[PDB]
Design an enzyme around this catalytic site. Structure first.
Site, PDB file in Angstrom:
ATOM      1  N   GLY A  34      -4.276 -16.278 -44.010  1.00 27.57           N
ATOM      2  CA  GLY A  34      -4.845 -15.225 -44.821  1.00 27.57           C
ATOM      3  C   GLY A  34      -3.854 -14.447 -45.652  1.00 27.57           C
ATOM      4  N   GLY A  56       4.249 -14.518 -47.526  1.00 26.30           N
ATOM      5  CA  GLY A  56       4.896 -13.336 -48.073  1.00 26.30           C
ATOM      6  C   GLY A  56       3.948 -12.708 -49.077  1.00 26.30           C
ATOM      7  N   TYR A 102     -21.186 -19.210 -48.519  1.00 22.47           N
ATOM      8  CA  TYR A 102     -20.172 -18.750 -49.450  1.00 22.47           C
ATOM      9  C   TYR A 102     -20.880 -18.145 -50.656  1.00 22.47           C
ATOM     10  CZ  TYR A 102     -16.642 -21.378 -46.818  1.00 22.47           C
ATOM     11  OH  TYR A 102     -15.812 -21.825 -45.813  1.00 22.47           O
TER      12      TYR A 102
END
Ligand SMILES: [Cl-]
Ligand code: NA
Ligand code: NA
Length: 323
Positions: free
Chosen positions: A205, A210, A51
């Protein structure tokens, strides 16, 4: 709610992802997202060495220095450089890979160390022996996997049992109402070994939260840079939305509450990029879907498969009627 990760250590029902902490979020907003997470009563941070090239770990590490208990998880297996042994489950790479996660997190023991992916080049025996040596050394407490197949989990568990090594505790898969193919082999394999799931990407993801405008279906931004393998998708997003606003809650919030209540799940990883997004995700703690909402959601996201190994007919003939 508190659960175990197949061990004695208990962990809160939501886990704080830290993928974003280098790429998008800055270190100060990272420290405050973490401060929020704690203040909401969490005790579970998931990071990785890859990361943001380990920056993600260092921010967590500095925040642990500022704050003076949290359960910390990190990973290996993925390229930290472009050399041939800067990736892999080899004990040569993992040895420096664990030492560097340790110095970057400033801890003396990682609670959960995870293999970020299967590695066909390393024999599993070498890897598990390295993790047992790490447990003996006090460098790590437990180990688990991410992105292992079903049979691969099963071979590891039994190979660990054969050599008197500790057992894997968790699996970190991708799992949400849109990505449910781990239910064919991977979930049965973990349940057989009493292991716990740590699902990530629970809003798929973004596709489930929405925030878009009845978008186009092959839009690569929300997912994968392909937008439809399993991200029908639109029916699932729609059902989630209907249940969302009748309960007076966000569409994200019932998708999150859907993952938290599925079989074998210990803790969902939250990908909050903002303080407000963390608040929006942690609203799902209050939501508890009724048995019906969920069996609704279940069947509309039921992964249909070619009949033989993992669809109706193969399932039906593997079943044993008690009568
Ligand atoms: Cl755990
Ligand atoms: Na539990
Ligand atoms: Na639950």
């Amino acid at each position: 709610y508190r659960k175990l990760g197949n061990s004695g250590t208990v962990v809160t029902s939501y886990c704080l992802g830290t993928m974003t902490f280098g790429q998008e979020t800055d270190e100060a907003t990272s420290h405050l997202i973490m401060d929020d997470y704690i203040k909401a009563g969490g005790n579970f941070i998931d990071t990785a060495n890859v990361y943001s090239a380990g920056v993600s770990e260092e921010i967590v590490g500095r925040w642990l220095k500022a704050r003076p208990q949290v359960v910390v998880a990190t990973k290996g297996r993925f390229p930290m450089g472009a050399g041939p042994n800067d990736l892999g489950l080899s004990r040569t790479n993992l040895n420096r890979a664990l030492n560097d996660s340790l110095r970057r997190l400033g801890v003396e023991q990682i609670d959960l160390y995870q293999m970020h992916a299967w590695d066909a080049v390393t024999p599993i025996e070498e890897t598990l022996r390295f993790l047992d040596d790490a447990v003996s050394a006090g460098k790590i407490a437990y180990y688990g996997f991410s992105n292992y197949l079903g049979w691969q989990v099963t071979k590891a568990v039994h190979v660990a049992r054969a050599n008197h090594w500790t057992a894997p505790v968790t699996l970190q898969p991708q799992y949400n109402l849109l990505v449910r193919d781990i239910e064919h082999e991977i979930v049965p394999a973990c349940q057989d070994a009493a292991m716990g799931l740590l699902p990530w990407s629970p809003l798929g993801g973004g596709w489930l939260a929405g925030k878009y405008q009845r978008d186009v279906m092959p839009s690569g931004a929300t997912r994968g840079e392909n937008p439809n393998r399993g991200m029908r998708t639109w029916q699932i997003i729609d059902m989630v939305a209907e249940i969302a606003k009748e309960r007076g809650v966000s569409a994200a919030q019932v998708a999150l509450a859907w993952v938290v209540a599925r079989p074998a799940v210990t803790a969902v990883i939250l990908g909050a990029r903002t303080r407000e997004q963390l608040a929006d995700n942690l609203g799902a703690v209050a939501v508890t879907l009724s048995t019906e909402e969920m069996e609704r959601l279940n069947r509309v996201s039921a992964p249909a498969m070619a009949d033989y190994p993992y669809g109706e007919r193969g399932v039906s003939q593997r079943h044993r009627k008690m009568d």
